[PDB]
Design a protein around this ligand. Sequence first.
Ligand SMILES: Cc1nc([C@@H]2O[C@@H](CO)[C@H](O)[C@H](n3cc(-c4cc(F)c(Cl)c(F)c4)nn3)[C@H]2OCC(=O)N2CCN(C(=O)CO[C@@H]3[C@@H](n4cc(-c5cc(F)c(Cl)c(F)c5)nn4)[C@@H](O)[C@@H](CO)O[C@H]3c3nc(C)nn3-c3cc(Cl)ccc3Cl)CC2)n(-c2cc(Cl)ccc2Cl)n1
Ligand SMILES: [Cl-]
Ligand SMILES: [Cl-]
Lengths: 138, 138
Amino acid sequence: PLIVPYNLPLPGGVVPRMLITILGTVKPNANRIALDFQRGNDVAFHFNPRFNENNRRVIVCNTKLDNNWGREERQSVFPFESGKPFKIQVLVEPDHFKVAVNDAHLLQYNHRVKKLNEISKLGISGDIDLTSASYTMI
Amino acid sequence: PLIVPYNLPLPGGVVPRMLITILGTVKPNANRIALDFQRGNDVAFHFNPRFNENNRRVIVCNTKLDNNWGREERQSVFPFESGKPFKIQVLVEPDHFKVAVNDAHLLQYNHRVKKLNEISKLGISGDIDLTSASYTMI
Ligand SMILES: Cc1nc([C@@H]2O[C@@H](CO)[C@H](O)[C@H](n3cc(-c4cc(F)c(Cl)c(F)c4)nn3)[C@H]2OCC(=O)N2CCN(C(=O)CO[C@@H]3[C@@H](n4cc(-c5cc(F)c(Cl)c(F)c5)nn4)[C@@H](O)[C@@H](CO)O[C@H]3c3nc(C)nn3-c3cc(Cl)ccc3Cl)CC2)n(-c2cc(Cl)ccc2Cl)n1
Ligand SMILES: [Cl-]
Ligand SMILES: [Cl-]
């Protein structure tokens, strides 16, 4: 049972072939979840399941540069379920992040922050019980 | 130079005579700051300087329980200055939090979440460069 928000420092920084695995359960009354790949106060990749953005479920992805969010990438395929276990995997490729939820490909996010090595940590926040957060190279 | 949003776990939980000190600089075009004393999925005490709430500066304080905000406490005495250093100290008393900014008493916030020792962490977010965040007992 990890404390949320949970900070996953990436000691040597993001590199292609890094594979991150997050296991947890969605809280019963969840509203929001966020994963934030950070380069300083910039957010290279924000992955944000919203359970009730006006009584809809959506995944919103974006980048925050100088405290300004950029173009939103939205999608409606929403694999999370209130009260239920989930698995998120993020695979870093040269040109994008790949995200798979519950072993199924969910989305790709093209890198906007190009200095991959400078992304130093993953923040995991929001309405989950967090079971595990880890990283390796594959 | 901490990463914002920054989460300061409070090992052992909030108790009276806990003193929290936050140091940083307000960004030059700041819009908002928030300190959130968190209890589980709730916010026992949200302290929220708004630099541009319809072209007025105001401090809003409130509590979030089961995702509902409560009664707002608003005040106009506004000690932050865009692009300038600040110091916030919060002293926990049995009946309220005391907040001082730049060594001067600013406000009190009477406890609404009475289970003080379940308040486990302080989140610090918004348009700041965060230099330090710490706690001790006095
Ligand atoms: C709708 C929207 N959302 C975004 C923006 O978009 C994203 C990327 O494109 C990104 O996902 C954002 N983001 C996600 C997270 C996040 C953080 C987190 F911890 C978890 Cl766990 C998580 F899963 C996700 N962080 N950033 C998304 O930004 C969200 C956003 O800006 N806000 C959330 C919705 N709003 C409120 O709830 C405001 O309500 C206030 C309330 N308060 C203040 C804050 C706050 C948060 C914060 F981080 C900082 Cl730095 C602050 F300084 C403050 N959070 N909640 C309180 O202050 C109460 C006090 O009484 O008042 C609420 C209020 N305000 C008004 C006008 N009314 N009320 C209110 C009061 C009461 Cl009593 C009752 C009811 C109400 Cl409604 C605002 C904050 N964007 C977006 C996208 C883009 Cl591309 C560009 C710009 C924006 Cl804004 N739009
Ligand atoms: Cl949000
Ligand atoms: Cl806001």
